[PDB]
């Protein structure tokens, strides 16, 4: 008798995880681990210049051991088989303003996406929810705050300046079990201006995690 092994692939999609996850107030410590699992993955991806502004909750794998594995790096190599007819039209509460602004992919873009996802994890429910890209920002702005046409990037397809200014809403209190340190990390990730956001490395190395 000879010996040989074969191993099973993990299909535990983050979305499935969230479906299995408990009500708003998902153990911050569990999320902290998953956050640093994600961000560590990002550092690798940023080191390898992996472009994937299209990365969404469902492209995040959460294994039975609590390991975040990232897959599906942008439309260029994904959905080669039956896909969504509204992959974009769908509420893009998990897409950075820079996506909504029709600009490009960046470290801040990626983190903005998952930042909302992390809040989703805490709430077991999408952080924001708008209709159009401008309406999506209109929901985003309610948490992070909003300025007129003086803190907007150059690459903006949306009517910047036609977004009536408003204050932020302490992420700590908005998102369930969001410890202030993570509230600040999230708020930084959620901040409209991509250059006012925190890098994957910086967030990863933050004492919060």
């Amino acid at each position: 008798i000879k010996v040989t092994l074969v191993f099973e692939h993990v299909d535990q999609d983050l979305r499935t995880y969230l479906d299995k996850a408990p009500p708003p107030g998902l153990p911050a410590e569990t999320i902290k681990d998953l956050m640093r699992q994600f961000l560590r993955g990002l550092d690798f991806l940023h080191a390898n210049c992996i472009v994937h502004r299209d990365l969404k909750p469902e492209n995040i794998l959460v294994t039975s051991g609590g390991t975040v594995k990232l897959a599906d790096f942008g439309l260029a190599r994904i959905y080669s088989y039956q896909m969504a007819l509204t992959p974009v039209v769908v509420t893009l509460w998990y897409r950075a303003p820079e996506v909504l602004l029709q600009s490009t992919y960046a470290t801040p873009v990626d983190m903005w996406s998952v930042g909302c996802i992390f809040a989703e994890m805490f709430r077991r429910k999408p952080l924001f929810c708008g209709n159009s890209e401008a309406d999506q920002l209109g929901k985003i702005f309610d948490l992070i705050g909003l300025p007129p046409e003086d803190d907007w990037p150059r690459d903006v397809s949306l009517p910047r300046g036609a977004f009536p200014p408003r204050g932020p809403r302490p992420v700590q209190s908005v998102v369930p079990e969001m410890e202030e340190s993570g509230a600040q990390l999230l708020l930084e990730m959620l901040t409209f201006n991509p250059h006012k956001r925190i890098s994957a490395f910086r967030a990863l190395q933050h004492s919060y995690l």
Binding site: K2, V3, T4, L5, V6, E8, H9, D11, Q12, T16, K20, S64, Y81, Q82
Partner: protein, 630 residues
């Protein structure tokens, strides 16, 4: 002035000891290095004779003679090369990092079909890994015969030799160390020969004191010849077969062969072979991965198939002979392993092409597939980039087929104009799945299913999500979609209401045994049946996964798929139960029947039975009732 200029120095006393202690690890390689040098010299002769054939007057034969001498515990190696002049002995032979091979190669810049190795200029000194002292005796055509003697002690001596004449070339006398006498063994010598010199162009002979105990000229020592070096268009099947049989030592010849060469920065020639039968240790975890061997200039370097080829292709035999690789000072190791990965990729492409053409040969493909479909399916599981190509090679038995397998594309060609998915069923056996209730309605609706009877099909089908634009669906899972005639749909909704309270009752009876109780038209001849939720393990996958010795049971909290009780409203039993619910939903005998039916369905549906003893005990009770025992 403010700066002094110095030439780099080299402490030979230390360097030499480093050469014969730290530069090498294996020591048996001394034969390789000396033989290689011999063949270089034999090529030197050849080239020179191309311009002046009278240079062959001092012997017209090109070969290497190995003559062990246990009486002295030495080894005599006769190299019938050109030879070395006294100047060459003191300039090239007695110099570190220097070889006249390079100078000869400079002469070869005028145009030649000559191929030599020796860019390091140190291999000679590997002789001192094994030998205590080495004596090199030579006779260059343009000089006298000299004896070069040294123990690598910082110096060497040269004197004109006396007695036996050398026509040309040189003899190496290896004064083998007292603990190196194992190299006087026939087997040990042949071991090394087969290890690195199996494709040396020149005849290498081994002389052994045998019947009358005289040195017998083992001319066949390296009779194996290179085939990929020859023009493939001029190589016959018999020649490819004999090579394969020599390559693999398999009395049976190959199923298929393919020559492959690349040109450019990477350059090599190669032969790939598909075996007719799989090896009994194909899956052995500790098996050395050496099916395809790597050579440089026909010199064996390594056989690390762990990186050369995919594990799922780890059955193809062959030889890859490169022209110029970045070998380390220790030739046994190759620098820039990414090169091997590039080679791999190119090989894979050619293997896939060979497989496709093999598939064109249906009869031999069937033979191939039967032997190596496990590896194909393994590739589906392991390789995310060539899966599509590999999926074209997949063949299964299907409802409209007999015992003949059919491709997934052939299945697709038989799909209905309203069929958007490939129906299939996995299991332990073809008969088992053929007799499943899950494929009965499917057959009644005129559909074909794919029979999947291997345990590895659970891993394969895991990756087979869509094929030729067609989706795939298991008949064993919930949500099985078959043509729904609006009339029938209404009737089914009426039936749902009809058996609504019945299903509720059954659920109350089996609240913790089944997740949901409902009727379904997927059933035909069975009163009921257990299905698997689209999330988690199937009855088959679950059973298989739970047979794994090294599995982690805690992961099953994420894999325990929901079980649901399908009911076939058309049966007298189901109808009776409905009537019995109306008569008395609290009837214990009825409740017992419901439990019986569930376990019966659960078990017959391929799901684990919680307690076979209790199950059979119920049966024993019922038997006793039939027997009138009690």
């Amino acid at each position: 002035e403010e700066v002094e200029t110095f030439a780099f120095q080299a402490e030979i006393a230390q360097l030499m000891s480093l050469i014969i202690n730290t530069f090498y690890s294996n020591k048996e390689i001394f034969l390789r290095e000396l033989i290689s040098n011999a063949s270089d010299a034999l090529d030197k002769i050849r080239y020179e004779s191309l311009t002046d054939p009278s240079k062959l007057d001092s012997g017209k034969e090109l070969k290497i003679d190995i003559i062990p001498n246990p009486q002295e515990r030495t080894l005599t190696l006769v190299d019938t090369g050109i030879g070395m002049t006294k100047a060459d002995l003191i300039n090239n032979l007695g110099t570190i990092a220097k070889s006249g091979t390079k100078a000869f190669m400079e002469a070869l810049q005028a145009g030649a079909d000559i191929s030599m190795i020796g860019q390091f200029g140190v291999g000679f000194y590997s002789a001192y890994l094994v030998a205590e002292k080495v004596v090199v005796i030579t006779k260059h055509n343009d000089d006298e015969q000299y004896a070069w003697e040294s123990s690598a002690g910082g110096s060497f001596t040269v004197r004109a030799d006396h007695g036996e004449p050398i026509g040309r070339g040189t003899k190496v006398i290896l004064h083998l160390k007292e603990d190196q006498t194992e190299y006087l063994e026939e087997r040990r010598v042949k071991e090394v020969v087969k290890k690195h010199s199996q494709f040396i162009g020149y005849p290498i002979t081994l002389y052994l004191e045998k019947e009358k105990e005289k040195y017998i000229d083992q001319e066949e020592l390296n009779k194996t010849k290179p085939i990929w070096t020859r023009n493939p268009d001029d190589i016959t099947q018999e020649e490819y077969g004999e090579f394969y049989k020599s390559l693999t030592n398999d009395w049976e010849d190959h199923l298929a062969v393919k020559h492959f060469s690349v040109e450019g920065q990477l350059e090599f020639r190669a032969l790939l072979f598909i075996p007719r039968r799989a090896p009994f240790d194909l899956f052995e975890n500790k098996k050395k991965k050496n099916n395809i061997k790597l050579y440089v200039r026909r010199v064996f370097i390594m056989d690390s198939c762990d990186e050369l080829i995919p594990e799922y292709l780890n059955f193809i035999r062959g030889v890859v002979d490169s022209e110029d690789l970045p070998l380390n000072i220790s030739r046994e190791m190759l620098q820039q392993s990414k090169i091997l990965k590039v080679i791999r990729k190119n090989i894979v492409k050619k293997c896939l092409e060979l497989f496709s053409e093999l598939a064109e040969d249906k009869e031999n493909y069937k033979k191939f597939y039967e032997a190596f479909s496990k590896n194909l399916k393994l590739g589906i599981h392991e390789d995310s980039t060539n899966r599509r190509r590999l999926s074209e090679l997949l063949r299964y038995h299907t409802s409209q087929s007999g015992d003949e397998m059919t491709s997934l594309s052939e299945y697709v060609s038989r799909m209905k104009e309203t069929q958007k998915s490939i129906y299939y069923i996995t299991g332990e056996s073809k008969e088992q799945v053929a007799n499943s209730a899950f494929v009965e309605r499917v057959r009644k609706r005129g559909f074909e299913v794919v029979y999947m009877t291997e345990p590895i099909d659970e891993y394969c089908v895991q990756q087979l999500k869509e094929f030729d634009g067609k989706s795939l669906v298991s008949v064993t899972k919930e949500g099985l979609e078959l043509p729904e005639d609006e009339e029938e749909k209404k009737k089914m909704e009426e039936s749902k209401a009809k058996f609504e309270n019945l299903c509720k009752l059954m659920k109350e009876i089996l609240d913790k045994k089944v997740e949901k109780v409902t009727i379904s038209n997927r059933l035909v001849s069975s009163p009921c049946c257990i299905v698997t939720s689209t999330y988690g393990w199937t009855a088959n996958m679950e059973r298989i996964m739970k047979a794994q010795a090294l599995r982690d049971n805690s992961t099953m909290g994420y894999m325990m798929a929901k079980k649901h009780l399908e009911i076939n409203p058309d049966h007298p039993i189901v109808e009776t139960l409905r009537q019995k619910a109306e008569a008395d939903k609290n009837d214990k005998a009825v409740k017992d029947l419901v439990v019986l039916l569930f376990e019966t369905a659960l078990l017959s549906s391929g799901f684990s039975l919680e307690d076979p003893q209790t199950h059979s005990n119920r049966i024993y009770r019922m038997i006793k009732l039939g027997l009138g025992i009690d």
